[PDB]
PDB file of N, CA, C and O in Angstrom:
ATOM      1  N   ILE A   1      -5.661   3.859   0.676  1.00  0.00           N
ATOM      2  CA  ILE A   1      -6.462   2.602   0.686  1.00  0.00           C
ATOM      3  C   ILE A   1      -5.522   1.380   0.581  1.00  0.00           C
ATOM      4  O   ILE A   1      -5.403   0.614   1.534  1.00  0.00           O
ATOM      5  N   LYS A   2      -4.877   1.159  -0.604  1.00  0.00           N
ATOM      6  CA  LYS A   2      -3.981   0.055  -0.989  1.00  0.00           C
ATOM      7  C   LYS A   2      -2.556   0.607  -1.277  1.00  0.00           C
ATOM      8  O   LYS A   2      -1.565   0.074  -0.780  1.00  0.00           O
ATOM      9  N   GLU A   3      -2.456   1.733  -2.046  1.00  0.00           N
ATOM     10  CA  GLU A   3      -1.327   2.583  -2.451  1.00  0.00           C
ATOM     11  C   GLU A   3      -0.440   3.114  -1.291  1.00  0.00           C
ATOM     12  O   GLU A   3       0.768   2.890  -1.290  1.00  0.00           O
ATOM     13  N   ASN A   4      -1.045   3.723  -0.213  1.00  0.00           N
ATOM     14  CA  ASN A   4      -0.416   4.216   1.042  1.00  0.00           C
ATOM     15  C   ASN A   4       0.397   3.193   1.917  1.00  0.00           C
ATOM     16  O   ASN A   4       1.021   3.565   2.912  1.00  0.00           O
ATOM     17  N   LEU A   5       0.338   1.878   1.577  1.00  0.00           N
ATOM     18  CA  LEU A   5       1.057   0.735   2.140  1.00  0.00           C
ATOM     19  C   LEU A   5       1.820  -0.065   1.056  1.00  0.00           C
ATOM     20  O   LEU A   5       2.953  -0.482   1.303  1.00  0.00           O
ATOM     21  N   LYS A   6       1.266  -0.265  -0.191  1.00  0.00           N
ATOM     22  CA  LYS A   6       1.905  -0.857  -1.399  1.00  0.00           C
ATOM     23  C   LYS A   6       3.096  -0.048  -1.983  1.00  0.00           C
ATOM     24  O   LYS A   6       4.071  -0.625  -2.465  1.00  0.00           O
ATOM     25  N   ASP A   7       3.020   1.313  -1.989  1.00  0.00           N
ATOM     26  CA  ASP A   7       4.041   2.302  -2.388  1.00  0.00           C
ATOM     27  C   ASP A   7       4.769   2.929  -1.158  1.00  0.00           C
ATOM     28  O   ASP A   7       5.237   4.072  -1.164  1.00  0.00           O
ATOM     29  N   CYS A   8       4.898   2.121  -0.061  1.00  0.00           N
ATOM     30  CA  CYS A   8       5.598   2.327   1.211  1.00  0.00           C
ATOM     31  C   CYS A   8       6.376   1.034   1.569  1.00  0.00           C
ATOM     32  O   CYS A   8       7.604   1.078   1.630  1.00  0.00           O
ATOM     33  N   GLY A   9       5.682  -0.139   1.783  1.00  0.00           N
ATOM     34  CA  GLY A   9       6.294  -1.465   1.999  1.00  0.00           C
ATOM     35  C   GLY A   9       5.487  -2.443   2.830  1.00  0.00           C
ATOM     36  O   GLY A   9       5.904  -2.809   3.928  1.00  0.00           O
ATOM     37  N   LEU A  10       4.310  -2.931   2.322  1.00  0.00           N
ATOM     38  CA  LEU A  10       3.446  -3.942   2.970  1.00  0.00           C
ATOM     39  C   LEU A  10       2.957  -5.022   1.974  1.00  0.00           C
ATOM     40  O   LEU A  10       3.542  -6.103   1.911  1.00  0.00           O
ATOM     41  N   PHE A  11       1.852  -4.766   1.203  1.00  0.00           N
ATOM     42  CA  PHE A  11       1.184  -5.692   0.280  1.00  0.00           C
ATOM     43  C   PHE A  11       0.732  -5.003  -1.035  1.00  0.00           C
ATOM     44  O   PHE A  11       0.513  -5.719  -2.052  1.00  0.00           O
TER      45      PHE A  11
END
């Protein structure tokens, strides 16, 4: 949801 991009490198 949020984690799959936040704990990768987006927002």
